[PDB]
Ligand code: HEM
């Protein structure tokens with residue numbers, strides 16, 4: 001469970017991300033595709049070359065969805081309900097992958113938020129992405 | 142999330158375990174110790190030889206809590222709150238391990254109850270050991 | 283494959299009693315039921331709405347016999363899993379786009395099914411040997427992914 | 429541990445700019461905060477109850493430097509990780525009882541700590557080589573577990 005402190009930590013760090021979300025999403029994805037190459041099997045219709053426009057466009061969406069969950073941090077299962085149905089009934093991405101993207105998003109933020117990526121924050125971001133992942137996975141079966 | 146069919150499936154299969162629960166809990170551990178030897182690091186105080194009495198005795202303990210969750214199926218977090226505390230703040234067992242015991246319990250059930258381990262029950266039993274694992278690790282941080 | 287002689291021998295002897303056709307169909311069907319997201323690779327097999335629909339489905343049974351058939355030929359090549367399955371690895375990554383986490387799921391289902399069929403005989407030591415084989419087969423099947 | 433020469437060169441390049449005492453402290457401390465169950469192994473270290481208490485605990489800082497010194501040394505032997513780490517692997521399994529998952533958690537924290545320290549220089553290609561490297565080290569530390 002996210003605590004008051006966690007929610008504050010996440011609201012501040014994500015607030016700094018500001019309007020870089022989209023770009024950080026794409027970077028997260030690129031990191032993901034290079035480090036954990038098995039994840040590319042879920043984007044075969046995607047061109048994965050560096051700086052690909054599909055990668056960018058998908059990052060913006062990922063980050064937009066993350067931004068929405070931050071805005072509704074106290075009602076995430078409802079705020080994310082639609083994404084959760086998509087991922088369970090249509091995309092059917094295996095659950096272990098969520099952890100991998102999460103790690104990459106954290107690397108990405110760490111690399112861009114030197115001052116705000118403190119230990120306490122990191123811990124909060126990590127719980128946060130695990131909550132998001134759990135909601136997106138909640139209807140799998 | 143457990144559906145009604147799931148609860149019914151679990152109550153019925155657990156019903157035929159009956160008085161062997163203990164013995165099945167002990168067999169599950171033994172299958173876990175031999176199949177996934179890293180799990181042995183969490184019981185450095187145990188005599189882990191085959192038939193040893195700490196393994197047995199601990200088998201029954203696990204079995205009984207399982208029983209308690211079957212009986213409190215609609216109410217797991219409260220029924221297991223104490224065990225949940227114990228694991229998060231004292232035993233501190235890494236979450237990955239829950240999946241290994243769950244898999245060994247299922248194999249133990251498949252080995253013992255042939256006609257009851259239909260495909261629908263397997264599915265339900267797996268969902269159930271996972272919700273139990275989720276509850277047992279929900280206060281870790 | 284750090285398999286021991288008595289492990290190698292525990293694996294082989296048991297495998298010689300397995301009805302590959304029945305076991306392969308039960309394995310593949312269970313995988314689809316227990317972990318429904320795996321159905322994403324099987325749209326054209328048809329109706330997979332319910333467990334009954336999945337276990338009765340002939341394309342499922344036939345695909346199952348085929349997968350274990352190849353798994354089976356693998357048990358003859360234990361000292362070299364990577365080599366035997368190399369092209370299988372490529373096809374799986376490059377034409378089929380099947381993530382390798384799937385191969386582990388199926389292995390774990392396979393072990394449940396062997397326990398279901400052989401009971402007392404599928405003892406704790408005999409299981410440990412299978413967990414090793416199944417993890418090796420999955421690793422070899424994934425070896426060519428890049 | 430399939431490391432390409434470009435990967436090895438990137439891993440080695442970066443590592444020369446690292447101050448191991450500081451990065452070791454940060455990574456062991458952040459592992460203890462981010463994943464508090466890993467504290468089970470350090471009860472003699474005193475107060476580990478708040479992030480400032482862990483990060484600044486002198487025992488944590490000294491153990492971190494020690495852990496990382498051995499990692500470094502590991503980077504001079506990328507071709508014989510297993511041998512290099514054999515005795516440590518034995519100690520961790522059979523005296524300290526440290527479950528191998530802990531090595532993977534620390535690797536992952538280490539990757540973010542590098543990320544934190546180097547900003548842009550921690551390119552996606554560089555990350556990817558460090559992941560293969562933390563994984564091989566985790567595996568080498570676990571290889572004597574039985
Ligand atoms: C942080 C967790 C994640 C979130 C918030 C997220 C969110 C989203 C969103 C907003 C979409 C767009 C769907 C639309 O157009 O309506 C999407 C699509 C998609 N996601 Fe997820 N995703 C997450 C993780 C993953 C992961 C881990 C994978 C697999 C590795 C994945 C695979 C896909 C695929 C294949 C699509 C469709 C791509 C396309 O054809 O456009 N997602 N996701």
Ligand code: HEM
Nearest residue numbers: 180183184202203206207224232234238239242273274277
């Ligand atoms: C379904 C999942 C599990 C349940 C229901 C469960 C239940 C229990 C119970 C009833 C106890 C005894 C508490 C008491 O002393 O009254 C216990 C303790 C313990 N468990 Fe868990 N357990 C589970 C999984 C695990 C796993 C995966 C591990 C790690 C491999 C583990 C490691 C331990 C340890 C080391 C103890 C303390 C044993 C002792 O020192 O005697 N448990 N658990």
Ligand code: HEM
Nearest residue numbers: 320323324348349350352353373378380384385388419423
């Ligand atoms: C024990 C591990 C597995 C083995 C040995 C195996 C083996 C095979 C073999 C021999 C083929 C024949 C392909 C051809 O005709 O060239 C095949 C096809 C296929 N396998 Fe695998 N398989 C395994 C696991 C999986 C699993 C886990 C999945 C996904 C859940 C999967 C998905 C497929 C698919 C989608 C095809 C193509 C079927 C078609 O023709 O429509 N396999 N497999």
Ligand code: HEM
Nearest residue numbers: 466469470494495496498499516520524526530531534569
């Ligand atoms: C990067 C992987 C690691 C390396 C290379 C490493 C290396 C070392 C070394 C060189 C020692 C001192 C050995 C001695 O006393 O003779 C040590 C001790 C220790 N390590 Fe590891 N370590 C690693 C990861 C971890 C992790 C992740 C944990 C637990 C989360 C852990 C737990 C311990 C403990 C409890 C000690 C003994 C501390 C004491 O002296 O009281 N290590 N390690």
